């Protein structure tokens, strides 16, 4: 067992030592959530502009420092119109005088940042109420957190990777991790 | 948990404790780093071990058993799930339950007149 | 026109029907065109054959709807076609009244455009533009089948009700009092049906070949076999071996829709050359994200955090009144053994003196929501609640959508 | 026939009575550690005897671990650390356990039958105890 | 470990039942026990019981048919106040009895 | 000497060193205030009483029992 008397030095030895030898993440989480919220492949590259506009961080800088991973057309209007041509067509209307002249600037305005921000029509305080106020502030976590295998969800054997630190459980998960999910390798 | 070690790195405080021991465990088919709790690294300080040394770890007991040095060729999974079967006569459990000194009593035979209600 | 029209818009699907019939009419709210460019009517994607590569162009986005002309086209299709809607009939709709639902958080300008359009092109004689949570406390006005779950145990409308509403767009929590929801205590859940579909696609890519191009199949599998973990995650994980289901993919030539082959049943003995994707691990993992978002490695607080924040910031006298009435409305609440888990984990998380009491409706909860808005019209308060054309006409267009239908009014 | 009281919940507080009033006789401190018994369904701060706190020290409890105590005897047993701290250590001898379901204060009654001579020997000779 | 199964469900402490008097003589004078036994002060908890169940019965006669009901207490501004007051007074009652 | 203690006031900081504080002792029929000596200060340092508690002290041996 343990030796009652052991070699002890003064210069290199210390009681505490025992050695024997031979922000950005939040951005990644938000981006992976929002890209997992996007279905169409063609819609993948444009939504980072939405993320940058909502977050307020510069688009180009976070785009360079973070690696991820139209709908309206007159012809489309035409084939959709003929699709249900059994019954179709409401009536719009227009008037005159300076009020309707000004309404011309807002009727069929065709304004879009990517879909719709592009306006002082929404107040900055109202913008904070819409976006910055609804989300919770202090309750970061109440319930316990569970970390399982990144491949199959196994939890009996917990072992983080040595290169990327990813948790692996089984031998198969380890052997398929190194070449596919272990980017640092 | 049985596998060869790669290195031992224990984080701590010079005077405040705060011990956070880490050591990579390798075998024929894994190379895994493990964060060790206070008890395991207290033991690892109790028994002197080196990086190339191989040890066997049991989760519940926390005891450590080292047998050889790069002598032993470990293989297989670290989290080997094997049973331990123990046989015993009811005399031993009777003596143990009779008295807290029953361990050394049966180890030395100086028992006697166990109450029949225990039986 | 004594019976109004009941329209319950949705980002995924719009519920609509007259005030007379019990069952609302169904119509998806999305426009899809094939890779070759052949657009399909929103009610006709279910009729097409090629479902491999489909790009969806829906007017609704993650938050709301923007394309006014496309949406108006959709409504014109859905309310002018009696030939494909049996029993239904609506020619012009002048005197016909409207019962329209909308989000509690409508944008000012978008609400302006919506009310302008509905009033001036659809000539609604009177209408009530209000969120579902306002119509919720009118459930006691009628007697019918209704089920309840107890967490602890193993006028003509109510006032103190806590509303949980989940939809494909998102999920919301609403405390309502006297019929007016407590707006500042209303919170949003970012996880929607689209996020669920995307995460199923990613997990299938990591466990099978690439089905990111496929979208209908993912919705089908999340609709027909996804179930909530009855107690916890670890017990389901250990018992996932016995809870294994195999889904036969639909061959484009013989079967438009696939089938899930249960190993425990022998009623399906015919073999198929088409490959079968086995499912044993993801059956309960997806609904566990509501209780434990961390299994998806996301930084969302969670349902329990949101509910505790909303109750704690709510006045203390009405918090037990809130937790005395919980009702689940929406499509996403149709998963089995879900609200029982909610009751159990609330009861664990709520103090002993309080009693958890959540009531669950059978079948689709969106249909029950349509029913409750439909029966709200029969209530004597609706005829007082409805607003006519003139009050919109003489007054400024912003007044009607800011005072009576404005969320800022009750903030 | 006998009746006892049941308590459970996880541990966060290890503080004695603050005793803001010195009164001229106290350098305010006591061997009575006030613990808010954090069960998910209830919480209460208890002035605990030196014996029950000594048994707490015997278990060497830390912040965030389920505990089980008695009103009368003060018996202390812990099912283990909570599952919240399971991810903190890759390995740990202490078992990570969930919080048992139930109220903080629970009352149970027993009608156990005990023969006369077991009480005879217990009265003639005390059975045992955890203390030195 | 196979022997430390739950026994609190079926074990008698027998120490709180003052039947271990052989160890009581270590730190007890006879006259102190004699005077502390005669000061078994009843009716001090019973007077609190009396002052509490007056309010308890008043509340029960006022709103005991609806506050205790789950349906009425689910949506009622002040009926839940009666319900929780009744629960609280019962809780203090049986705690004082304990 | 049997009597319920009313209050205890010791000047352990203004003067310290067993300032001979005064404690008031009550009974159901009579109540008096008793001086506390230095040795009594040390005695009351043990078997600590925060008042609001019935204690008795032997007249001869001066031993205080907390009832
Ligand atoms: N029976 C069911 N089983 C599983 N999921 C369902 C079921 N019914 C509906 N859902 C889910 O609910 C969502 C429908 O949301 P819905 O409430 O229609 O949104 P909206 O509020 O915009 O109408 C779909 O994405 C679907 O995945
Ligand atoms: F409007 Be949604 F799809 F909840
Ligand atoms: Mg909707
Ligand atoms: Zn795994
Ligand atoms: Zn790796």
Curated annotation (Swiss-Prot), chain A:
One of its GO terms (cellular component) is chromatin. A zinc finger (HIT-type) spans 149-182. PROSITE patterns: ZF_HIT (PS51083). Keywords: Chromatin regulator, Metal-binding, Nucleus, Zinc, Zinc-finger. Zn(2+) 2 binds at residues 161, 164, 177, 182. The keyword Zinc applies. Disulfide bonds: none annotated. One of its GO terms (biological process) is protein targeting to vacuole. Zn(2+) 1 binds at residues 149, 152, 169, 173. The keyword Oxidoreductase does not apply. It is found in: Nucleus. This is Vacuolar protein sorting-associated protein 71. It comes from Saccharomyces cerevisiae (strain ATCC 204508 / S288c). The gene is VPS71.
Curated annotation (Swiss-Prot), chain D:
It comes from the Eukaryota. It is found in: Nucleus. Probably forms a homohexamer. Interacts with RVB2 and may form heterododecamers with RVB2. Component of the SWR1 chromatin remodeling complex composed of at least ACT1, ARP4, RVB1, RVB2, ARP6, YAF9, VPS71, VPS72, SWC3, SWC4, SWC5, SWC7 and SWR1, and perhaps BDF1. Component of the chromatin-remodeling INO80 complex, at least composed of ARP4, ARP5, ARP8, RVB1, RVB2, TAF14, NHP10, IES1, IES3, IES4, IES6, ACT1, IES2, IES5 and INO80. Component of the R2TP complex composed of at least RVB1, RVB2, TAH1 and PIH1. Interacts with SPT15/TBP and HSP90. Belongs to the RuvB family. Present with 11600 molecules/cell in log phase SD medium. DNA helicase which participates in several chromatin remodeling complexes, including the SWR1 and the INO80 complexes. The SWR1 complex mediates the ATP-dependent exchange of histone H2A for the H2A variant HZT1 leading to transcriptional regulation of selected genes by chromatin remodeling. The INO80 complex remodels chromatin by shifting nucleosomes. Its ability to induce transcription of some phosphate-responsive genes is modulated by inositol polyphosphates. The INO80 complex is involved in DNA repair by associating to 'Ser-129' phosphorylated H2A histones as a response to DNA damage. The gene is RVB1.
UniProtKB/Swiss-Prot annotation, chain E:
It is found in: Nucleus. Belongs to the SNF2/RAD54 helicase family. SWR1 subfamily. Catalytic component of the SWR1 complex which mediates the ATP-dependent exchange of histone H2A for the H2A variant HZT1 leading to transcriptional regulation of selected genes by chromatin remodeling. Present with 656 molecules/cell in log phase SD medium. Component of the SWR1 chromatin-remodeling complex composed of at least ACT1, ARP4, RVB1, RVB2, ARP6, YAF9, VPS71, VPS72, SWC3, SWC4, SWC5, SWC7 and SWR1, and perhaps BDF1. This is Helicase SWR1. It comes from Saccharomyces cerevisiae (strain ATCC 204508 / S288c) (Baker's yeast).
Curated annotation (Swiss-Prot), chain F:
It is found in: Nucleus, Nucleoplasm. It comes from the Eukaryota. Signal peptide: none annotated. DNA helicase which participates in several chromatin remodeling complexes, including the SWR1 and the INO80 complexes. The SWR1 complex mediates the ATP-dependent exchange of histone H2A for the H2A variant HZT1 leading to transcriptional regulation of selected genes by chromatin remodeling. The INO80 complex remodels chromatin by shifting nucleosomes. Its ability to induce transcription of some phosphate-responsive genes is modulated by inositol polyphosphates. The INO80 complex is involved in DNA repair by associating to 'Ser-129' phosphorylated H2A histones as a response to DNA damage. Present with 3030 molecules/cell in log phase SD medium. Belongs to the RuvB family. This is RuvB-like protein 2.
